[PDB]
Each structure stands twice: as structure tokens, then as C-alpha cells.
């Protein structure tokens, strides 16, 4: 509902990504994430299912 959605900028995962460090998030093509921080052009911080961490930006599409 609206409280969960306020203020959130969403992301679509374009390709599966398997984590390669403890601060990375494994995601699957089609997953919908929340964007936390896009200031690094190669790695975006995201929130997904109670995790917060990094996924490469090339794997992600902003849903706006």
C-alpha cells in the first residue's frame, strides 16, 4: 500500500546477478528492487527483501 511505496524509486533487474562479496545482493532477472544510492556509476546500493547492498548498475533499470 502507499506507506511502503512512498518516496521509493524502484529498479527492475535485467539479468541475474550472483553476489561476489558480503556487501553484494544476489538478484534474479525480473526482481523489483528499491534504489538507495546511485552516486557510483558502476555499483548501485539497493534494498530487496530486508537486504541492503550493492548490485552493478548495468544489471538494473530505473522504473521512475
Curated annotation (Swiss-Prot):
Residues 6-64 form the SH3 domain. It is found in: Cytoplasm, Cytoskeleton; Cytoplasm, Cell cortex. Disulfide bonds: none annotated. Belongs to the spectrin family. Morphologically, spectrin-like proteins appear to be related to spectrin, showing a flexible rod-like structure. They can bind actin but seem to differ in their calmodulin-binding activity. In nonerythroid tissues, spectrins, in association with some other proteins, may play an important role in membrane organization. Like erythrocyte spectrin, the spectrin-like proteins are capable of forming dimers which can further associate to tetramers. Interacts with ACP1. This is Spectrin alpha chain, non-erythrocytic 1. The lineage of its organism: Eukaryota, Metazoa, Chordata, Craniata, Vertebrata. The gene is SPTAN1. The chain holds residues 965 to 1025 of 2477 of the full protein.
